[PDB]
C-alpha cells in the first residue's frame, strides 16, 4: 500500500513542477511581446 | 548708400524670419514621432 502512495505523491509533485514549467514559459512568452514592443519603439526612434 | 544699409538690414532680417519659420515647422514635425514613441512605450508597460 505504502509503495503505491509514494508513486502517487511523486505524481502529484510532477504535476506541480509541470505547472511551474508551463507558467514559466507563459511568463517568458509574454516577455517576448514586451520586448517586441520595445523593438517597435526603438525602430521608430531611428526613424526620428 | 542709405537705401543700401536699409535694404541690407531688410534682407538679413528676412532670412532670419525664414530660419525661424523653418525651425518651428521641423520641430513641430519631430514632436509627432516622439508622441507615437510615448504611446508605444506605454504599450510596452501594458505588455509588462
Q: What is the DSSP string of A1-48?
A: -HHHHHHHHHHHHHHHHHHHHHHHHHHHHHHHHHHHHHHHHHHHHHH-
Which residue do the cell numbers 514592443 mark?
A37
Closest Cα in chain A to B26: A48
Contact B47, A30 (CB under 8 A): yes
CB–CB contact B30 A48 (8 Å): yes
Distance, CA of A32 to CA of B17 (rounded, Å): 49
User: How many angstroms separate the CA of residue A19 from the nearest CA in chain B?
Assistant: 21
What does the alpha-carbon distance between residue B45 and residue A38 come to, in Å, rounded to a whole number? 10
Amino acid at each position: 500500500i505504502s509503495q503505491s502512495e509514494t508513486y502517487r505523491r511523486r505524481r502529484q509533485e510532477w504535476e506541480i513542477q509541470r505547472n511551474n514549467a508551463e507558467a514559466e514559459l507563459k511568463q517568458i512568452d509574454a516577455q517576448l511581446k514586451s520586448l517586441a514592443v520595445r523593438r517597435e519603439a526603438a525602430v521608430l526612434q531611428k526613424t526620428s | 548708400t542709405q537705401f543700401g544699409s536699409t535694404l541690407q538690414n531688410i534682407i538679413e532680417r528676412q532670412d532670419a524670419e525664414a530660419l525661424n519659420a523653418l525651425l518651428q515647422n521641423q520641430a513641430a514635425e519631430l514632436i509627432l514621432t516622439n508622441l507615437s514613441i510615448q504611446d508605444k512605450t506605454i504599450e510596452e508597460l501594458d505588455a509588462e
